[PDB]
């Protein structure tokens, strides 16, 4: 199992849908025997440059140990869900559980 | 590349001892397994010439080793190539 690190930015008008979404993604990972090493809702945040003409995207961070098939499925879900503006699944070597600088 | 556990299993199978890694038979077996594994990759990626260079090197090493076995000990050579199902 490969340690990943997903960060996805959500449309701020759909910020209320975010708790359910987090639950769904985590649930899928667990269902597929995926561990969840850190989970940080960073919330609404000011973009450094306007994406799709809209500012203030809602950032969610998720460091996960999962299989790659499930990572692929998650990526596909991200791409087709017209809610997540950006995503960034990024491989990591170890269990990076400590809290991130943005929460710090 | 070949995973650690798989490599260990190969070593145990053909290795006189589980700390034996240099034995000719073990070396040949490891090369063969690697080559077999890489077949799928090269079927997918026919233009991966650099990687195929690596594969070719593996093949050459196996041939050289096999030849060494043939001259040294014929029975071992015959048994090994029957076990592995390698032509000549």
């Amino acid at each position: 199992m490969r340690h990943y690190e997903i960060v996805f930015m959500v449309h701020p008008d759909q910020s209320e849908q975010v708790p359910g979404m987090i639950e769904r993604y985590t649930a899928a990972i667990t269902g597929a025997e995926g561990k969840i090493h850190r989970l940080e809702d960073w919330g609404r945040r000011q973009l450094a440059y306007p994406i799709n003409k809209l500012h203030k995207a809602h950032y969610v961070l998720m460091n996960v140990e999962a299989p790659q098939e499930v990572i692929d499925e998650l990526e596909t879900t991200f791409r087709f869900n017209d809610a997540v503006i950006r995503s960034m699944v990024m491989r990591t070597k170890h269990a990076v559980t400590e809290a991130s600088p943005m929460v710090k | 590349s070949l995973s650690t556990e798989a490599t260990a299993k190969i070593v145990s199978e053909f290795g006189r001892d589980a700390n034996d890694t240099g034995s000719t038979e073990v070396q040949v077996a490891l090369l063969t397994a690697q080559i077999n594994h890489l077949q799928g990759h090269f079927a997918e990626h026919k233009k991966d010439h650099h990687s195929r260079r690596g594969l070719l090197r593996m093949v050459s090493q196996r041939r050289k080793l096999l030849d060494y076995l043939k001259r040294k000990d014929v029975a071992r050579y015959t048994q090994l190539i029957e076990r592995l199902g390698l032509r000549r």
Binding site: V7, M9, L47, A48, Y49, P50, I51, A57, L61, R86, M88, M90, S100, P101, M102 | -
Partner: protein, 66 residues
């Protein structure tokens, strides 16, 4: 001066926008290693981090109005 020397930084983090802002100029461009004094390995790591942040709109690509 090479900030990471006191740590011997274990790994540069693209989310650490606080420090990456030391390694980007006013216009958003990456500062040369010769000017900031970063070690070469670390400089490469930082550049990668900056690029990732830019992708995630944590840092800006350029100093323009928005």
């Amino acid at each position: 001066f090479c900030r990471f020397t006191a740590e011997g930084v274990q790994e540069i983090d693209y989310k650490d926008i606080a420090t990456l802002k030391n390694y980007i100029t006013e216009s958003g461009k990456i500062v040369p290693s010769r000017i900031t004094g970063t070690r070469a390995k670390y400089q490469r790591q930082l550049a990668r981090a900056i690029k990732r942040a830019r992708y995630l709109s944590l840092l800006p690509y350029t100093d323009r109005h928005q």
